[PDB]
């Protein structure tokens, strides 16, 4: 056992907390340069080991959950949010089945319904934006996506109940993902803990009623809720109501912020590159016709440029900057032996931006995918949706959602930067959102 290089800090408990917190990507890129692909450090009492670049990241992406374990690092925070019997509250093999059920629900049939739903929700929402102005697009997209994702992933019944009170319940749930929740005992009656737990109760209740309501109807509905009510584990057991409601909460949380932040970033990338924005609008017309009829799933698959714009946005601004495991058993990578008790980390952000493999790395270039590039060229250089056992199941929905929304948005408006300001990254929020995401827009042609 030869340990990975350890980046010493004189600062007792915090370690590099402050430096890492200010700009993590720069921290990790500098470390990579000085120490190589595999290294360790301590922050706020804990020892972290990073695996940077494709070859090293392979260890995390290939590992069995018995070896590199997700619930050890996640369950404490997620279980009060998503609920019992779901996600990281059960053995991983169970979660894998639950994922299979969800995957089965995320199919082409349902996507075809989703496109119209999302186009409709989007046009209606942006009516309040009028003909022109300067508004906060991240807030717009967050508010819209909570609606679109509910409608698609929860259904019409639940969606019609989605008022501001319920939206706030969902925000209160997000609050469970706090520094306080990580650092402090659960038994402290902190406001955010109280809200989180209260909101979890009220939201489950709404889902309980909607679930029993559908079970009792003879109206055969073909949607994702139905797929869950009809699904079964290998043992044959159907999901309980509490299980289903748990999975519905997850579906929303997963469906919202990863898309909203991403969609916001794409907005500013396209605003900065007006020629690229024009080409996208022209692509709309080419594929769908000059009359611009209602979007269809099949038309989305032909929006190749828009697709590469999403792909490239994800490259430079992946919503999930980190993926972490607890090493239960010793692991070997790059000559080093990582001991049990280490938390093993990967950063899509760093891998997706690495000097050695990405040409003009900090450039937003959708066309980079028309040549040889590390997305096709390597295993794990490009990993915004992860890989292996804990890999994402929502990639196709997310693309459906983001494509439809932005397809519609390009049709409605042309977008510009304000005083040539391109938003900086707000590192203090859980998902790195854009700072001051106010965008200028005027009605399109
Ligand atoms: C742009 C949108 C999205 C991005 C960038 C994204 C990214 C990711 C990433 C990086 C992981 C790997 C987590 C890890 O290895 O620790 C993941 C896992 C997952 N995602 Fe997504 N995701 C997105 C949308 C969605 C959606 C819409 C859903 C549900 C419909 C979803 C459900 C999941 C689930 C269930 C997992 C598995 C977690 C696990 O096995 O531990 N995601 N996602
Ligand atoms: O929301 C979390 N995970 C997300 C990751 N995601 C989103 C889209 N694709 C993947 C997530 C994972 C599983 C699910 C999910 C699970 C089951 C299901 F049926 C449906 C969805 C939903 C999610 F939103 C999450 C949030 C916080 C944390 C957390 N872990 N540690 C912290 C933490 C640590 C230190 C300081 C501050 C926070 O935060 C871990 C995971
Ligand atoms: O352990 C986490 N952060 C670590 C830092 N780190 C980052 C990379 N390696 C170490 C961390 C961050 C802040 C702090 C901390 C900060 C302030 C303080 F007063 C005390 C402690 C402690 C930490 F251990 C961590 C782990 C998982 C996640 C995370 N996983 N999933 C999410 C996520 C997913 C979806 C939506 C929102 C969050 O978040 C976020 C942070």
Going from N- to C-terminal start, the domains of the chain cover 16-443
Determine which residue's CA is closest to atom 19 belonging to ligand 1.
Answer: 392
351 lines ligand 2 (CB under 6 A): no
Q: Which of the 8 DSSP states describes residue 426? A: E
Q: Mark the breaks in the chain: residue after which each occurs, C to N over 2.5 Å.
A: none
Rounded distance between C-alpha atoms, residue 298 and residue 279, angstroms: 20
Residue 422 CB less than 6 A away from ligand 2:
no
Closest residue by Cα to residue 388 from 61, 118, 70, 44: 61
CA dist 424 and 119 (Å) reads 29
| CA–centroid distance for 203 within its chain | 21
- Which element (helix H / strand E) includes 372? none
Instruction: Specify the ligand 1 atom closest to the Cα of 262.
Output: 1
Asked whether residue 152 is marked as a ligand-binding residue, the answer is: no
CATH classification (class only), 16-443: mainly alpha
Whose atoms come closest to the Cα of 261: which ligand?
A: 1
Please identify, by atom number, the ligand 1 atom nearest to the C-alpha of residue 389.
40
392 CA to centre of ligand 1 in angstroms: 4
Report the distance separating Cα 413 and Cα 194, nearest Å. 41
Ligand (nearest to CA of 76): 2
Asked if residues 444 and 410 have their Cβ atoms less than 8 Å apart, the reply is yes
CA distance 89 to 417: 44
Could you tell me the distance, in angstroms and rounded to a whole number, from the CA of residue 14 to the centre of ligand 1?
A: 30
Pocket of ligand 3 (CB under 6 A): 17, 43-44, 46, 48, 177, 179, 183, 257, 320, 322, 324, 345, 430-431
Phi, psi of 52 (to 5 degrees): -105, 145
Distance CA 74, CA 78 (A): 6
Overall resolution, Å: 2.5
DSSP conformational letter for 424: P
Which residue in 159, 145, 143, 152 sits closest to 207, CA to CA?
A: 159
The residues facing 439 across adjacent strands are 135
The rounded distance, in Å, linking the Cα atoms of 66 and 388 is 14
Q: What is the layout of strands, in order, in the sheet containing 413-416? A: 132-136, 438-443, 413-416
Contacts of 373 (CB under 8 A, 6+ apart): 358, 359
- Which strands form 68-69's sheet, in the order they lie side by side? 38-43, 46-51, 343-346, 323-327, 68-69
DSSP 428: T
Q: Is the beta carbon of 182 within 6 A of some atom in ligand 2? A: yes
The distance between the two most distant Cα atoms of the chain, rounded to a whole number of Å, is 67
CA dist 84 and 242 (Å) reads 8
369 CA to centre of ligand 3 in angstroms: 31
Q: Is 363 exposed, middle or buried (0-12, 13-18, 19+ CB in 10 A)?
A: exposed
The sign of the torsion formed by the CA atoms of 123, 127, 132, 135 equals negative
Residue 77 Cβ < 6 Å to ligand 2: yes
* CA nearest to 309, candidates 298, 320, 317, 299: 317
Instruction: Specify the residue with its C-alpha closest to ligand 1, atom 38.
Output: 390
Q: Cα dist. 340→295, 323, 442 in Å?
A: 51, 17, 56
CA distances from 358 to 28, 334, 364, 369, 377 (A): 17, 21, 11, 11, 11
Closest CA to 405 of 115, 107, 111: 115
Which residues sit with their C-beta closer than 6 Å to ligand 1? 70, 99, 251, 254-255, 258-259, 262, 318-320, 323, 384-386, 390-394, 397-398
- What is the C-alpha to C-alpha distance for residues 401 and 75, in angstroms, rounded to an integer? 28
CB-CB contact of 48 with 345 (8 Å): yes
Question: Is there a contact between 91 and 411 (Cβ–Cβ < 8 Å)?
Answer: no
Whether residue 352 contacts residue 323, with contact meaning beta carbons closer than 8 Å, is answered with no
CA–centroid distance, residue 184 to ligand 3 (Å)? 14
51 CA → ligand 3 middle, Å: 16
Provide the pairing of β-strand 413-416 with 438-443.
antiparallel
State if residue 98 touches ligand 2 by the CB under 6 angstroms criterion: yes
Tell me how far the alpha carbon of residue 251 lies from the centroid of ligand 1, in angstroms. Answer: 10
Ligand 3 mean position to 177 CA, how many Å?
9
Nearest to 70 by CA among 344, 386, 258, 253: 344
Burial of 222: CB neighbours in 10 Å, binned 0-12, 13-18, 19+: exposed
For residue 135, what are the β-bridge partners? 439
The span from the CA of 77 to the CA of 200, in Å, is: 13
8 CB burial (10 A radius; 0-12, 13-18, 19+): exposed
Experimental technique:
X-ray
Q: DSSP label at 23?
A: -
């Amino acid at each position: 056992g030869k340990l990975p290089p350890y980046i010493f800090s004189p600062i007792p408990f915090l370690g590099h907390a402050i430096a890492f917190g200010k700009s993590p990507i720069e921290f990790l890129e500098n470390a990579y340069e000085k120490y190589g692909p595999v290294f360790s450090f301590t922050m706020v009492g804990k020892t972290f080991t990073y695996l940077l670049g494709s070859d090293a990241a392979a260890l995390l992406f290939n590992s069995k959950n018995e070896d590199l374990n997700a619930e050890d690092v996640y369950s404490r925070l997620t279980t009060p949010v998503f609920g019992k019997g779901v996600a990281y509250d059960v053995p991983n093999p169970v979660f894998l089945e639950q994922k299979k059920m969800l995957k089965s629900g995320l199919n082409i049939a349902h996507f075809k319904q989703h496109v119209s739903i999302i186009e409709k929700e989007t046009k209606e929402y942006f009516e309040s934006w009028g003909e022109s102005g300067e508004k906060n697009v991240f807030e717009a997209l967050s508010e819209l996506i909570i609606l679109t994702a509910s409608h698609c992933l929860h259904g019409k019944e639940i969606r019609s109940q989605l008022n501001e009170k319920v939206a706030q319940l969902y925000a209160d749930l997000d609050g469970g993902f706090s520094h306080a929740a990580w650092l402090l005992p659960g038994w402290l009656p902190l406001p955010s803990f109280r809200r989180r737990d209260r909101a979890h109760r009220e939201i489950k209740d709404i889902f309980y009623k909607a679930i029993q309501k559908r079970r009792q109807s003879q109206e055969k509905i073909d949607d994702i809720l139905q797929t869950l009510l009809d699904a079964t584990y290998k043992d044959g057991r159907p999901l309980t109501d509490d299980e289903v409601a748990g999975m519905l909460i997850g579906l929303l949380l997963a469906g919202q912020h990863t898309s909203s932040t991403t969609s916001a970033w794409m907005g500013f990338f396209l605003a900065r590159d007006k020629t690229l924005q024009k080409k996208c609008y022209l692509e709309q017309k080419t594929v769908c016709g000059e009359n611009l009829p209602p979007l269809t799933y099949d038309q989305l698959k032909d929006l190749n440029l828009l697709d590469r714009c999403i792909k490239e946005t994800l490259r430079l601004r992946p919503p999930i900057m980190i993926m972490m495991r607890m090493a239960r058993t010793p692991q070997t990578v790059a000559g080093y032996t990582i001991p049990p008790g280490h938390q093993v980390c990967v950063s899509p952000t760093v891998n997706q931006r690495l000097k050695d493999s990405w040409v003009e790395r900090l450039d937003f270039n959708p066309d980079r995918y028309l040549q040889d590039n590390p997305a096709s060229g390597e295993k794990f250089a490009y990993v915004p949706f992860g890989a292996g056992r804990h890999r994402c199941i929502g990639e196709n929905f997310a693309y459906v959602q983001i494509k439809t929304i932005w397809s519609t948005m390009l049709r409605l408006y042309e977008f510009d930067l304000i005083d040539g300001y391109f938003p900086t990254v707000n590192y203090t929020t859980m998902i790195h959102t854009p700072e001051n995401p106010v965008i200028r827009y005027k009605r399109r042609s």
